Amino acid sequence: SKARVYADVNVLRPKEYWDYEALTVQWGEQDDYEVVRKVGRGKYSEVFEGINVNNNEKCIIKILKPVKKKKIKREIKILQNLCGGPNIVKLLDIVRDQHSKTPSLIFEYVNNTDFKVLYPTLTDYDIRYYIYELLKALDYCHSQGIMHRDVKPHNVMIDHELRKLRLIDWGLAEFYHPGKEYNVRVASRYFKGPELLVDLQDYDYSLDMWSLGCMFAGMIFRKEPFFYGHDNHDQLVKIAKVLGTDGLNVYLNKYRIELDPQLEALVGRHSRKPWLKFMNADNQHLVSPEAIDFLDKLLRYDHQERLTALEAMTHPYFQQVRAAEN
Ligand SMILES: CNC(=O)CSc1nc2c(Br)c(Br)c(Br)c(Br)c2n1C
Numbered sequence: 193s194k195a196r197v198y199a200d201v202n203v204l205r206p207k208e209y210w211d212y213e214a215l216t217v218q219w220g221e222q223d224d225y226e227v228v229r230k231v232g233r234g235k236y237s238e239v240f241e242g243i244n245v246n247n248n249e250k251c252i253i254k255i256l257k258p259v260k261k262k263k264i265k266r267e268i269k270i271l272q273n274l275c276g277g278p279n280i281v282k283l284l285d286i287v288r289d290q291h292s293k294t295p296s297l298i299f300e301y302v303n304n305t306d307f308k309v310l311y312p313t314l315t316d317y318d319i320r321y322y323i324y325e326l327l328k329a330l331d332y333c334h335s336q337g338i339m340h341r342d343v344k345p346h347n348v349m350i351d352h353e354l355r356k357l358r359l360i361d362w363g364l365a366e367f368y369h370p371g372k373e374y375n376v377r378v379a380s381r382y383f384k385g386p387e388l389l390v391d392l393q394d395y396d397y398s399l400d401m402w403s404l405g406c407m408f409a410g411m412i413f414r415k416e417p418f419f420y421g422h423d424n425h426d427q428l429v430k431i432a433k434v435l436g437t438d439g440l441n442v443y444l445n446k447y448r449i450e451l452d453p454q455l456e457a458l459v460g461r462h463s464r465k466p467w468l469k470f471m472n473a474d475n476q477h478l479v480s481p482e483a484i485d486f487l488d489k490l491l492r493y494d495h496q497e498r499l500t501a502l503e504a505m506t507h508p509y510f511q512q513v514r515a516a517e518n
Pocket of ligand 1: 231232233234235237238239252254281299300301302303304346349358360361
């Protein structure tokens with residue numbers, strides 16, 4: 193398996209672009225940035241609104257929990273490489289506490305509204321609009337040789353007043369090398385691609401498109417998360433029971449993958465269940481023909497069949513968004 197677009201990006205670029213292990217961090221000044229209030233947390237970091245004391249400009253301060261140097265350099269290198277791209281969070285500085293050596297990444301401030309609260313307020317048009325903005329970011333990172341590998345609403349910061357979107361948390365992100373084979377324990381559970389749940393390791397940018405399709409199905413059908421499985425095996429069952437097992441079996445044999453007796457056992461046998469079955473009164477104002485056609489083109493087992501980010505941006509679904517922009 194190789195990517196159908198942008199397969200040769202890191203091949204033509206000089207080694208220093210993608211050789212993140214050879215980066216030497218140029219640590220800024222811890223004191224320039226003061227923590228103002230906690231705004232979030234996850235498995236690998238704590239996140240604070242901050243102030244730059246030099247210029248009194250707001251910022252985001254990401255304090256990293258203890259992390260291997262290899263892996264923080266990967267996140268730093270990817271951030272530097274994408275800094276300035278459309279809707280990509282901007283890294284501004286990297287600093288460390290002198291005593292304990294605990295690193296903090298400093299970013300542009302985005303006044304986010306949490307998705308659990310934001311997304312049920314979105315009109316059919318805002319959904320179009322914000323999904324388009326997020327597609328610009330994925331196209332750009334893909335065109336630069338990078339897979340984000342952790343697309344989810346928690347990783348998409350939205351200032352809904354400025355109509356502004358940033359893709360954040362590049363901590364699971366990786367450079368793309370044709371036919372290189374990758375760790376499958378990436379993404380977060382509800383957003384993992386079939387490729388991940390079946391041990392297909394030579395995956396690519398297309399993995400972020402599955403994750404975007406999960407996010408999008410969540411939004412138009414008002415069902416967050418869309419595929420709600422308890423552990424990884426349960427995750428593939430939840431998908432199978434929507435896409436049907438027939439399509440899974442053809443996927444499995446194209447890429448020559450055997451599905452582990454117990455997993456095979458768990459998945460069983462299922463009809464495909466039409467996208468229209470998820471329609472109800474709460475969600476009806478969001479589930480038009482064009483939304484479904486687009487969703488159907490993202491949530492395909494076969495990662496090679498999914499639309500690329502550049503294709504998605506052209507689909508008739510976003511025609512009003514393009515026209516406003518042009
Ligand atoms: C692991 N999950 C979290 O930390 C969620 S809370 C949160 N993390 C943020 C990060 Br990182 C950046 Br960068 C920016 Br900009 C904003 Br705004 C963030 N907010 C609100």
